[PDB]
């Protein structure tokens, strides 16, 4: 009925051992299965019946457990192993399958502060009725980052959306985009636009701003 995976994210380096946990709310009749899933691809069976490897699955992948506790173990992480993993369960009847919410295995590397940039809305865009202010957080690690928008010192909440890239193939960093949306009328009613970034790599939060 319910499967809880932990931790939400596992930050490890290649060569390290990964231990992923899945806990069922009640004892499962049939030992669980595990799946690996990469961005934009179908899931792929790794383990079934708690400890059996699916065809084509390399030996570094192993599983164990029974009752309510199951574990997926990757003895030594290879670069291609960094992905999201889901545990799954099903019974004869009712026949519905239940899925854990997934555990992301992420590459761990040294802390890297992001370089920050703020972009005012283009005159081209203003020529249409809308204003988008963009804040860029370039190549940082870890993933945790705080982006705060301020307009003439008023904290902006609910009018921004952000996007994050996948961990970079060569430097294992993340990059983020935060877009603040304001009507053109409101944009012209204020002067100071600021993006404040808080990150472990930044000994002091960094603020990038401009005056309209």
């Amino acid at each position: 009925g319910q499967l809880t995976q932990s931790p939400a994210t596992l930050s490890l380096s290649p060569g390290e051992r990964a231990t992923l946990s899945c806990r069922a709310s009640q004892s499962v009749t049939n030992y669980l299965a595990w799946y690996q899933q990469k961005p934009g691809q179908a899931p792929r069976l790794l383990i079934y019946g708690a400890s059996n490897r699916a065809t084509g699955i390399p030996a570094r992948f192993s599983g164990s457990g029974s009752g309510t506790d199951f574990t997926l173990t990757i003895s030594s992480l290879e670069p291609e192993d960094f992905a999201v993993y889901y545990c799954q369960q099903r019974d004869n009847w009712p026949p519905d399958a239940t899925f854990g919410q997934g555990t992301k295995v992420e590459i761990k590397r040294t802390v890297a502060a992001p370089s920050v940039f703020i972009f005012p809305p283009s005159d081209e865009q203003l020529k249409s009725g809308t204003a988008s202010v963009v804040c860029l957080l370039n190549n940082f690690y870890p993933r945790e980052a705080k982006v705060q928008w301020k307009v003439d010192n008023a904290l902006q909440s609910g009018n921004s959306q952000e996007s994050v890239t996948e961990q970079d193939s060569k430097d294992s960093t993340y990059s983020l985009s935060s877009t603040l949306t304001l009507s053109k009328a409101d944009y012209e009613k204020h002067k100071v636009y600021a993006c404040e970034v808080t990150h472990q790599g930044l000994r002091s939060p960094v603020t990038k701003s401009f005056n309209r």
């Binding site: 299965a33 179908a42 369960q89 370039n138």
Partner: protein, 206 residues
């Protein structure tokens, strides 16, 4: 050897229908229970329905009961999902899955997935806006208000790739997507934007 290929996914307006297909090969289809599992944007896997090997038994997630109908053809070895009265929240990549041979409570094979987008948004090409003392500089393009996915972005016709970051598109409250593509530099800069759905093409020099 075993293979599952889906089709039928597409963009549709709320209240309308879609019929999804999953053609199987490489195994005796009729001997296996078959399922549909979905994954909404940014979410985890979610079971949808199942049809017994002999097609006489079916079961559904409560959220789709009465709207979706699962069926199969054991001659053409195909699994189907007729989706009626679609809502915006049905939007997700739909996967067909085969009950495992060694263990039927597992899914040994999955289809590649087919996107079901339920929106009243109109097919629209993107407007491309420029994003214009320091050791490093950043610039880029704001690919705004397009629908549906996807758009491709390249810089200087592909010659420029180092330091480039094209961000995942986000669904604005308007129902249209918007994304940014940036490049940092320590030359002329042109972002090449292509949106097939609207056969829109733009080379924006920043």
């Amino acid at each position: 050897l075993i293979n599952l290929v889906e089709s039928g996914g597409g963009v549709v307006q709320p209240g309308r229908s879609l019929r999804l297909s999953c053609a199987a090969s490489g195994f005796t289809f009729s001997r296996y229970g078959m399922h549909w599992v979905r994954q909404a944007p940014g979410k985890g896997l979610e079971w949808v329905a199942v049809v017994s090997s002999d097609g006489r038994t079916t079961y559904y997630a409560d959220s789709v009961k009465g709207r979706f109908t699962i069926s199969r053809d054991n001659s053409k070895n195909t699994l189907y999902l007729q989706m009626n009265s679609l809502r915006a929240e049905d939007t997700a990549v739909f996967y067909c899955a085969k009950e495992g041979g060694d263990n039927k409570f597992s899914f040994d094979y999955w289809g590649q997935g087919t996107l079901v987008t339920v929106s009243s948004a109109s097919t629209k090409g993107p407007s491309v806006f420029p994003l214009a003392s320091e050791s490093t500089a950043a610039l880029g393009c704001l690919v705004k208000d397009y629908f549906p996915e996807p758009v491709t972005v390249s810089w200087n016709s592909g010659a420029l790739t180092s330091g480039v970051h094209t961000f995942p598109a986000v669904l604005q409250s308007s129902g249209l997507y918007s994304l940014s593509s940036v490049v940092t530099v320590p030359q002329t800069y042109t972002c090449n934007v292509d949106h097939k759905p609207s056969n829109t093409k733009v080379d924006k020099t920043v």
